[PDB]
Amino acid sequence: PAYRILKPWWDVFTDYISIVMLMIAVFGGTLQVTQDKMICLPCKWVTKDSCNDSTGPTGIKYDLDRHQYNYVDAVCYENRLHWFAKYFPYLVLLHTLIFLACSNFWFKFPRTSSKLEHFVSILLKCFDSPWTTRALSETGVLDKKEGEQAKALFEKVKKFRTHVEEGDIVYRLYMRQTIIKVIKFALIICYTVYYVHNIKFDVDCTVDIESLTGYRTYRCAHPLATLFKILASFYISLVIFYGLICMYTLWWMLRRSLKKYSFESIREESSYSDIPDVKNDFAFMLHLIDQYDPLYSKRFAVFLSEVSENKLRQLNLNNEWTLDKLRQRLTKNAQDKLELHLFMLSGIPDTVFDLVELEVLKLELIPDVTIPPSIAQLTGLKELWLYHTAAKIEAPALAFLRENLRALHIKFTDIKEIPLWIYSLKTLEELHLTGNLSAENNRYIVIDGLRELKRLKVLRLKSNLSKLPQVVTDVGVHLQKLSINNEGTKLIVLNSLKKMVNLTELELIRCDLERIPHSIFSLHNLQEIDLKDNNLKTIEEIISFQHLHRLTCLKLWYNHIAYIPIQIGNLTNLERLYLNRNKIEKIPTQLFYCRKLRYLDLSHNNLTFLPADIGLLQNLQNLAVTANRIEALPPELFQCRKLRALHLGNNVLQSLPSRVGELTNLTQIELRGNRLECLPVELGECPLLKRSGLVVEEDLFSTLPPEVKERLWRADKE
Amino acid sequence: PAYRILKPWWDVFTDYISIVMLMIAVFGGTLQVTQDKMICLPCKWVTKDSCNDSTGPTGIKYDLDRHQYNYVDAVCYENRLHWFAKYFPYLVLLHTLIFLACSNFWFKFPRTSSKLEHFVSILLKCFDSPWTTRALSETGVLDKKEGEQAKALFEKVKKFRTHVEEGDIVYRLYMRQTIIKVIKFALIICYTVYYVHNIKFDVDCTVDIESLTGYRTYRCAHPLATLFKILASFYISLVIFYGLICMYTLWWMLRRSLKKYSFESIREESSYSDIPDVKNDFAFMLHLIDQYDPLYSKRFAVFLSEVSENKLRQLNLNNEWTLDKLRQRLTKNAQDKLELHLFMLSGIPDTVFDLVELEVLKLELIPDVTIPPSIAQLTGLKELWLYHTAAKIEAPALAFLRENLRALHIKFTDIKEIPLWIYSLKTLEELHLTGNLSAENNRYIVIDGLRELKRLKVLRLKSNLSKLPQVVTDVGVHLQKLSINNEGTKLIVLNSLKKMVNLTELELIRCDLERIPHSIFSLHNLQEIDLKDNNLKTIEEIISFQHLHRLTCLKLWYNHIAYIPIQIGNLTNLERLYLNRNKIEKIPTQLFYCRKLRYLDLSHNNLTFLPADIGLLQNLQNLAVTANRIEALPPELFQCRKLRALHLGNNVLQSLPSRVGELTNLTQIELRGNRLECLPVELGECPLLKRSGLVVEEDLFSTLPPEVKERLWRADKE
């Protein structure tokens, strides 16, 4: 009912031939059992154990009782009848039983029976699956249950292939059965043809029975001899057909090396070129099914293609993640735009394009993903993150992003991972590059197309570059903010900054320059400048910084600066100053000449004293002197009531002056890490400073007056 | 188990006839086995190997024992009884078995058994399909899974047809089987009719056994001979019927040329000419099923016709997208026009034309759309948007569109996918081209039909063109509005804009001119000019702007203009002029000669304070200096009474002048990102200012007195 698919035409023909042989055997057996008598008459004149056949004629008197005739018949039948005539039906019954056993040996051998049952069940599953139909049709949307069932079928197929690949028992067992059938046919043909001529109607008998009858020899007649001869010839012809069929099977087994399956036809005509050529013990069962019907093999092809696996994986992925689950996965980033981050997925779920509220999409380790056009449903998309994903795109989505995308982030370890189509994103304004780009004789080759980014305004370079790309210098004609992170690689300007005259922010982090380039000063449009981690020692180049009439903020944090040049007194244009984590030891008075200053951090330095001129900078809002050696505070500092916060931590401030409460606009303090005796009570008179804004160790905190404790706590509550 | 559907009436009759033949075969066989004795007597007077046939009568004494009679019977039965009388039933059994084997060969031959079971399975699937019931009843909405299974059935039918039309095995096998049946019938009837005469009741046997009985020849009676004779006559009659039926089947197979099926009645009973001529190995099963009955063939032919599949799949689409679902998804676009979006649909739902209330429709990513005449149902439709949707049009559809269309948007990724009929329309007022049509050596030829748009007035050409096509200038002799966006590509004018005398609103977006061409100056009737991000640096050409007498609006922002020339004040006609996002640092007093100016934007510029002359332009209502370096608000600006918006957010404003309450018409105020400590109270006396209208930080918003905040909240509430 189910294994009939596994029976080629030769097998079913041999089964029918065996059934016919069995019918012949049972008919001959019942015929011989019911009546197989001999009829014997004695030879009156006999020589050489055979009589010579020598008014009206009269009968011959033998003077024998009927029982004497019966006794002679029995004796001659048991003795002088050829054993072939006596035992032909049982012989053919035994031979056909052996043939049936040989046919069914591999079916009843559990070691290969389990493999055959698994093969047939899996082949039926692959034949009746709905996924293979659509896979062949394509050369979509489906239910959860059917998708997971199809996935289970795929993994069962892989397990079955692993199991049957190393077996190589079915092929040799089939060879053994075919050889056994062939040799049985050969011996049967030889001996049966040799002995068939030994059954005949006339037979002679000489049994040395005189004391019971008185005659020596008898001419016996075997009435069933001719019918048995006809049955024997019919059976011999049947065995000849059986042997011819078995020999054809043997030849079929030895003309194409059935151990190996070509598989080329369907793997090339269905465009699934990634279909393996099947190997031993698995090519053979596929050959058998081909002999039944190649359509089953064609259906089973799509479960080894290695590509249909990707298709099913992405389809089940699209099935699983629902828009509700994605919204629960939705997060708000630092820049306060609606964010969904995809990490370590085989592909992009299609339901992510159902969230019209999405603004920024991230792709972290997503292999072989091509952007579907359904991205058009995402109106708010402005930022796209490529965290180590080489992603392709099609024309409609490409145009949609060309007209809609504003920010792009590329994190890569290889240049080939960069999507070549990004250069058409003519509405792109901000791009972030992470990954080395220098190539042996092909460095700065991919980025030549950056001239196409006409609306580019922000660029992030993290590639350990030693010479700045010329194309960057060219495109900087409209750039407004440029950030580079060489991560320890020394960068040489080679006077390649005097063409990005539109730049308004220049950040050079970990570029290891050790000097301030002169082309910085030529950018009079600059406003904010940083020289992080370039091991700066002397910043006297600020002499040429007076050309920068609109330089507002300057950062020299995390450098090796030891002193503040007096020239900064001339550049009063500064509004934010960052100099922490340097080796600066003292504050010259000239620094206090920038009266419009609003931010000042001098943390992590060798500073020991605070000059009194700090009070001259009324607009200062925050102060940071963390990790310094200041022990006492000049009271003039407390004349800047508009100082919202101050960072005195990790210092050696012995005692806080009581004027601190005069700073009403103050809201935050840093006091942990300093050797203080008791907190001033006047500190608790600040209208806006709260326990949240009051940072200090608990031992100094408990010395606060109880009214101060209650006021700070109630400010924290509300 | 409806396998008999492939058995015609004659196959059934042959089966029954074979059953009867086998029945008489087993009857004759068991009769011959049980009793076939031939009773022989010697005759004393022999003439020519035969009995001469020559006081009361007395018997004849032959002097033979019973056993000698038995021996004579055996020998004469063996030798001189004609073999036909002995072996008639076995021959009948053999022939009946051969006939049954021929009849069931194709059922039991696995190669063709596979195709036959495949065909019967798919046919039984098709017969029970409600799709057939609905299609034949057509001569309303059901389950989606029903449409899906119908489409899957269509696909599997296509795949099977592709599989089986090339085989040509079942026909040749059936032909060979029926030929074998007929030739076997001929041979058997020949020999049986010839040899049935030897079934005689009495037979003379001359055997030459003298030494055993002493009689030369014997007369024998075969008692069963007459019964065998009538059995053989009956068998001959049955074989005659069987052979006549097989001859009829041969005639049926050799007159209709069964290799090709007709499928002709379909196009006259259901007007379905969507059915091919079925080739070999598939017409055969169709013919056989027809011989059963044609109802199955008819109810199966529908699944072959692709047009019926398309129409009922469209029915399924309508089942998914019902009219109420459409109106639920119905939206209004920004231009106050009822619009529905059809994004990534397989085909146009038919129900959409039940809603005449639509005037704008957008078709994006809907493959192979052919515009139906049912678009005539939508009278008020005026605008259609084509997004990557190559559309074929119909004559009623083209007629309706050439007289009931006002504006058209077509976007295309390739030249070949533009519909060619669009130029033929005459009522089209607005055409929107969005797609790179740049071609080499045959540029501006694909749109050579552009001159056929005689009612065109508004034209949007976003095609990344290097120079303006001459055909565009040809059509521009009568146009009104032209919008060009080259996406950063430089636009070449070269005396190709002075011919658009009737243009009313000119817009150049990222045309990369970098310098205003003189051509615009010849267009006196022009009203509004835009140069969005055309990399402009010098705008001296505004001196020639006095040629444009009615020029009231100017758009030059998103450019790199640093200094405003004075002579722009000579244009008193100006009404709205935004100049944000430029390098403007000081507004010349001459610019304030444009007394009729009403809307001004100066955001993202480098101003520090404002000239007094702005107070003299009372006609202004909207001012925008957002995100700038304006130190303080000059009070003279309060003299412009009808100001309803002041976009002053993100400035360096320190203290807001109290005269803000002087603006009664003041509606919207944005002040985020300003260094403002305290707010004036007059801000709460503005009748048209509301809490949403006033954009200010909530903690800073709490600086206002409680009455101010309460009044603003009450005004905003209703």
Residue numbers in the entry:
A (entry chain D), B (entry chain C): 15 to 68, 92 to 176, 230 to 808
Question: Which lines from the publication concern this structure?
Answer:
These modular proteins consist of a transmembrane pore and cytoplasmic leucine-rich repeat (LRR) domains. Here we address this question by generating synthetic nanobodies, termed sybodies, which target the LRR domain of the obligatory subunit LRRC8A.
To explore the relationship between inhibitory sybodies and binders that potentiate channel activity, we have determined structures of LRRC8A in complex with the sybodies Sb4 and Sb5. In contrast to the three inhibitory sybodies, which target each subunit of the hexameric LRRC8A channel by binding to the convex face of the LRR domain, thereby stabilizing distinct conformations, the complexes with Sb4 and Sb5 display a high conformational heterogeneity where the LRR domains are poorly resolved in a majority of 3D classes. In both, LRRC8A/Sb4 and LRRC8A/Sb5 complexes, the sybodies bind to alternating subunits as their epitopes are only accessible in LRR domains located at the r-position of tightly interacting domain pairs whereas they are hidden in the dimer interface in the l-subunit. Their interaction with residues located on the edge between the flat face and the concave inside of the LRR domain involves repeats 2–14 in case of the Sb4 complex or 2–7 in case of the Sb5 complex. The smaller interface and lack of aromatic residues contributed by Sb5 is congruent with its lower affinity compared to Sb4. Both sybodies target overlapping sites, yet with different binding modes and they bridge the large fenestrations between adjacent domains at the loose interface by approaching the juxtaposed l-subunits. In contrast to the stabilizing effect of the inhibitory sybodies Sb1 and Sb3, the two potentiating sybodies Sb4 and Sb5 appear to increase the overall mobility of the LRR domains, which is reflected in the poor resolution of the respective region in both complex structures. At such conditions, we found very low response in non-transfected cells and a pronounced, on average fivefold increase of currents in case of cells expressing Sb4 and an on average 2.3-fold increase upon expression of Sb5.
